[PDB]
Amino acid sequence: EFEGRWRVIPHDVLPDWLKDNDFLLHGHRPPMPSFRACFKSIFRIHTETGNIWTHLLGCVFFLCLGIFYMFRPNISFVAPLQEKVVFGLFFLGAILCLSFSWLFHTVYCHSEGVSRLFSKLDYSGIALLIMGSFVPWLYYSFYCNPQPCFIYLIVICVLGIAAIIVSQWDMFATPQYRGVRAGVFLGLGLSGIIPTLHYVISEGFLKAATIGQIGWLMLMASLYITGAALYAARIPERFFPGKCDIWFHSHQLFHIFVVAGAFVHFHGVSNLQEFRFMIGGGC
């Protein structure tokens, strides 16, 4: 098309608001204050191609998975309205996170102001992913006891809202604060260790590891700590500058870790429900 033609550019030519990873040396999209060109650029090769498509493709996937769940027969659930509301909040959190992300990774190169607004929606989406993922997990983990279930819900929501308020600070988006983000969100998700200690302290290592939770929760902490480590350390683009530029750089692998992470997490709480059903609502 002879409308909105652009070329990829090296890092040095990017304005300071687009310059974020000095290991992605070429393949950058230039500032294009046209969302027409921005959304058309989804069908182009560049540093954000994979970022766009992993969370764009992953967003339609959670959208389908969250629609199909809503239309599940109500005999499957002990309390289908309640049980569907808890999963619903996880699914919305998963959908919003991926949407804010693929939208931001798309309209990113548009302007400084636009990238500034959508990056704050992008960060905020991570916090809503963690918050929402806790809701069905606490519903089944603290099923027969609601004093911790209520407290831990407020704890994850008070922490998540703080993370979301800290995401509005413009320093938080700078590449000097990259480690601070990987710690802020990593801390948010790892704070689940509080209710894990508490659950284990009252059910015991038998009632906790027999029911898969311990084996699953560890893999989840692996995905969380390995994943955040990649983002903050910029691996592998640190070891192969200008070679891992279009495919397989850290932000791209991190997207895969987020979609995979939210799938492992869904399959986990979709087991706590398959189990709570095989036992009914007894206390």
Ligand X SMILES: CCCCCCCC/C=C\CCCCCCCC(=O)O
Query: How far is residue 256 from each of residues 21, 94, 155, 266, measured CA to CA in Å?
Result: 19, 14, 28, 15
Whichever of 47 and 101 has its CB closer to Zn ion, that residue is 101
C-beta separation of 194 from 154 below 8 A: no
Peptide bond preceding 236: is omega within 30 degrees of 0, i.e. cis? yes
> By three-state DSSP, how is residue 11 classified?
helix
How is the chain split among helix, strand and coil, in percent rounded to 5? Answer: 70, 0, 25
11 labeled binding residue: no
* Interacting residue ranges for ligand X, rule: CB under 6 A: 122-123, 126, 129, 133, 181-182, 185-186, 189, 223-224, 227-228, 231, 254, 257-258, 261-262, 265
Contact 34, 4 (CB under 8 A): yes
- Residue 67 binds ligand OLB, judged by CB under 6 A: yes
Span near ligand DO3 by CB under 6 A; candidates 8-16, 35-43, 137-145, 210-218: 8-16
Does residue 243 bind ligand DO3 (CB under 6 A)? no
What's the rounded Cα separation, in Å, for the pair 65 and 262? 12
Site string for Zn ion, 79-118 (x = CB under 5 A): ----------------------x-----------------
Query: Which residues ranging from 183 to 242 are in contact with ligand OLB (CB under 6 A)?
Result: 189-190, 192-193, 196, 200, 205, 209, 214, 217-218, 220-221
Separation of alpha carbons 29 and 94, rounded Å: 28
3-state secondary structure 149-214: HHHHHHHHHHHHHHHHHHHCCHHHHCHHHHHHHHHHHHHHHHCCHHHHHHHHHHHHHHHHHCCCHH
Residue 26 interacting with ligand DO3 (CB under 6 A): yes
Q: Which of 2, 3, 5, 16 forms a contact with ligand DO3 (CB under 6 A)?
A: 16
CA–CA separation, 117 and 111 (whole Å): 10
223 binds, among ligand OLB, ligand X, ligand DO3, none (CB under 5 to 8 A by kind): ligand X
List interacting residues with ligand DO3 (CB under 6 A): 8, 15-16, 26-27, 45, 112, 245-246
List interacting residues with ligand OLB (CB under 6 A): 34-36, 39, 60-61, 64-68, 70-74, 80-82, 84-86, 88-89, 91-93, 99, 103, 128, 130-133, 135, 137, 139, 143, 146, 149, 153, 157, 189-190, 192-193, 196, 200, 205, 209, 214, 217-218, 220-221, 265
